[PDB]
Amino acid sequence: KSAVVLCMDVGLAMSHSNQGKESPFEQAKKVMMLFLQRQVFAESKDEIAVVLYGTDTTDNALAREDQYENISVHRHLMLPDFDLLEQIENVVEPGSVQADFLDALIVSMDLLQKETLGKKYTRLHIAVFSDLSSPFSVDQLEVIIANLKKAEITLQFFLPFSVDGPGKGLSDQQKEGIEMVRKIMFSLDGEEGLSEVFTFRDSLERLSI
């Protein structure tokens, strides 16, 4: 079996709807639901956690004043079920704030480190869904990368636009986030990584590999 964290940006920017009929938030939720439905219907043994960042409340093991704020562990590492499906469809809502995606990655890594103790997995996987609209701190990113390598974690980023026609009006902050994603993925996978940025439209199939 494998262990997967879905690390989902639910910050305020994700609710801005100017691409089609579904906002980035609603598109990412739909992908998560289809993925989880596939897993439930197939009776897969993979364990799947859900970490949300950009939530109005804070609920994670690293949270303490001014640290890892606005990040919530919605589902711990366990088999998916219909309660999870019901919550994601009805409970999970857009947040009214923003959070640091590297903080959310650290929470996700800490969850995996603790909750995979004493168990055997073929792969550890973290999938991040975001529009990269909000700032982040790179403090100690070199430690994060070292541990992602040590634990052989596969990291996938999914964005609601292509980063390979007209330009898409990406903010400077989004462009900085994209470059950081590229630096992280290259650190992990080398030259191949520079292109390992995926879109929401391809995310369901890339997840289900």
Binding site: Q67, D110, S137, D139, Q140, I144
Partner: peptide, 11 residues
């Protein structure tokens, strides 16, 4: 903005 990593990451 500095952060504090959990000890298992920096041990």
């Amino acid at each position: 903005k500095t952060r504090v990593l959990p000890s298992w990451l920096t041990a």
